Amino acid sequence: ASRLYTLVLVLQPQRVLLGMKKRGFGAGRWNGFGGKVQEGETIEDGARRELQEESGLTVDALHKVGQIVFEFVGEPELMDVHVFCTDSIQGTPVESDEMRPCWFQLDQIPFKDMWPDDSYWFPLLLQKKKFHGYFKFQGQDTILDYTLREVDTV
């Protein structure tokens, strides 16, 4: 049993937009934009909504790039995270209550202040490969086990 979440990475050939999370789950970490999917909206529409909410931005098209399932020891609900990607954005990243957006060079991606799974699956993101992931967490810092597989169909 699982719960739907979104994750949106604005990926430009020289840079990638991340946002610093100021409160709530996983605060004090750089991350993609997104959150819970609501009843009555599609997964992609939820991904867009959260992008607009957290960074101000709107996009033409969002591309499905992966799916990562997260399991936390002691929590029965799984996180079913649908990952999206886009180069073309409309507007300017501005700050919100949830996220402080900031651009990063592709050779300065701040992995040590990101969720530790990001080390594993970013290579496939940057190479424009579609993927299915699973990561079992113990607390916020410790990956007990994982799988990561390139797929053709997300």
Ligand X SMILES: O=c1[nH]c(=O)c2ccccc2[nH]1
Stretch that binds ligand X, among 38-46, 87-95, 101-109, 114-122 (CB under 6 A): 114-122
CB of 85 to ligand X, least distance (A): 13
Does 26 bind ligand X (CB under 6 A)? Our answer is: yes
Among residues 6, 132, 25, 134, the alpha carbon closest in space to that of 71 is found at 134
Does 50 bind ligand X (CB under 6 A)? Our answer is: no
Three-class SS state of 69: strand
Stretch that binds ligand X, among 41-49, 85-93, 100-108, 111-119 (CB under 6 A): 111-119
CB of 90 to ligand X, least distance (A): 24
Does 131 bind ligand X (CB under 6 A)? Our answer is: no
Does 118 bind ligand X (CB under 6 A)? Our answer is: yes
Tokens of 46: 């939820």
Distance CA 30, CA 22 (A): 10
Residues 6 or more apart in contact with residue 12 via CB below 8 angstroms: 87
CB of 89 to ligand X, least distance (A): 19
For residue 125, report the phi and psi dihedrals to the nearest 5 degrees: -65, -50
Residue 49 CB: number of other CB atoms within 10 A?
A: 16
Among residues 142, 105, 106, the alpha carbon closest in space to that of 122 is found at 106
CB of 47 to ligand X, least distance (A): 13
Stretch that binds ligand X, among 37-45, 85-93, 110-118, 144-152 (CB under 6 A): 110-118
Interface ranges with ligand X (CB under 6 A): 7, 26, 31, 70, 79, 115, 117-118
